[model samples]
Target chain A: GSSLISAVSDKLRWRMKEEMDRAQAELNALKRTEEDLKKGHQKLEEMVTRLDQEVAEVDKNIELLKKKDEELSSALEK
Target chain B: GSSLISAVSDKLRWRMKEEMDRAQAELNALKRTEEDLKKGHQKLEEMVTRLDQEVAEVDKNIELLKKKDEELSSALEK
Candidate 1:
């Protein structure tokens, strides 16, 4: 009976170790996932900033074009 | 001796269950993280597409403005 009990305990210990290993693997993967997300977010932030600047420049150019148009129209009237 | 062996085996079984539970918890958490990352990426994609569309519209508007400016200048010259 003691021998049987030892065998069962041994199997349980093995299973426990297996679970621990699986958990550790999952934890490592999660860490990688977090790192990837952070990098992705950083890239997106940079892209957003660049796009915002482009939009601002476009607005400024539009204003300049309108002013020039007004001047040309005034000259034609004169 | 049999009773002592049985107690130890029981404890080992309990620890095995604890490990299993921990593994299960980690698995669930990882799944949630994946879902969150997917949603975040989807949002970022939508934002990028919106920005691109805005940029394209701005270009179109700029071209129209230039055409009008040229027309006005020609009229003034005439």
Candidate 2:
């Protein structure tokens, strides 16, 4: 026959480690995903930095082109 | 005296629940960071695409400017 506190303590003994194991496994997956995502973000930041420089160069070239076009137009007018 | 098996089982029940909870919390934080990074990457991708078009336009402008300058030089010589 089971007593009161003993029955409660029996409950505390844990019928299964299934939930614990599942959560532990899930944590492993989350860690892997988190790590991969961090790497992905870093690559993206590098890409953005490089692209920013490329865009600036393009802008500079456009500015130079506009100035030279204006010069040619002035020369033709004179 | 505590039964070795029972104490170990009890440890599994709640003590490791503490660990599981902490891990789940960390996973949530990682997920938040991942989502924010994803959004930032999307923005960067859009910027890259726009800059690609801008660069192409700049190249086109440079080509036009060079042709105009050459035409002006030809006329001046003639």
Candidate 3:
């Protein structure tokens, strides 16, 4: 007795599985890229903060120097 | 006459396809996030550049003010 079963052929099933496997691998790779980008952004933000602080300090120095200049001019006038 | 064929079940094949579809969707979403991160980094870099320029200008101001103070002091001594 021979029985015919209607189902996905082995070849087609293998192809589908292969596609899924590739997709999963690609997904993992993308996830890694996402992580790297996040880390890079964080580091950049840190740099920005540091630079901002340096600018603030420099501004203070400029203000102090200007004040000193004003005081010296007043003394010289007297 | 009945024939038995060895093949993948429809249920399993559908599951594989579903997984592939989900993986593809996730991959697309991750790609978009990657682009956003890149744009964010670029904007941040631009800010850093602008801030750096401001700091340079402020430094020059400080130098000029100090020079003026020295001149005032010299004039007072005479």
Candidate 4:
């Protein structure tokens, strides 16, 4: 039979190794999920920024057209 | 000595409680993440729609400008 210290040491070692393996597996899965999420967020951010610029450019052109319309109407009246 | 059935009943109840807690936590986290994703998708959809409308308006104005330029150039030749 094993001594008391030997038995307890063996049990402790087994428990520690089991917990370490479980924790490592969970963390690795979490890391992979986090990387995928980061990529998705980056794509979403880029699309939103591009839309914003396009919207601004459109507004600028609309203002220019309105100005031209006013000028054309005045010239026709003259 | 306690009957085997009594011991088994206690073990089953304990196992059930532990499993319920673990499942509940996992589900709660999943629900929160799902809500966040829904919000992000809604925001992205709105931006895309606004951008599309703005781009269409810009195209209309560009067409109008092209027509006015042709008219002006033709009148200069007359």
Which candidate ranks first by TM-score, i.e. highest? 4
**For candidate 1 chain B, which ten residues in a row score worst on lDDT?**
B44-53
The top-ranked prediction according to DockQ is 2
Could you give candidate 4's per-residue lDDT for residues A7-61 as a string of tens digits?
A: 5446555655665565566556556656656655565566557656655665666
Residue range B1-78, candidate 2, lDDT tens digits:
868986676565545546545555665676687887667655655554565566557657767998999988887845
- Model 3, residue A15: distance off in Å is 1.5
Q: DockQ for model 2? A: 0.03
* Model 2 Cα lDDT, one tens digit per residue, A1-78: 558986675454333233444544655566676678878656655554565566557657767998999988987845
Superposed by TM-score, candidate 2 places the C-alpha of residue A23 at a distance from the truth, in angstroms, of 38
Per-model lDDT: 0.65, 0.63, 0.62, 0.59
Tens-digit per-residue lDDT, B1-78, candidate 1:
258986786576556556545655655576577678767655655554565566557657767998999988987845
**Candidates ranked by TM-score:** 4, 1, 3, 2
Q: What is the TM-score of each predicted model, taking all chains together?
A: 0.44, 0.42, 0.43, 0.47
3 or 4, which is superior by DockQ? 3
Number of clashes in model 3?
6
| DockQ-superior candidate, 1 or 3 | 3
Can you tell me the CAPRI class of model 2?
incorrect
Residue pairs in steric clash, candidate 3? A2-B2, A2-B3, A3-B2, A3-B3, A3-B4, A4-B3
Q: iRMS values in order, in angstroms? A: 25.6, 24.5, 25.2, 34.4
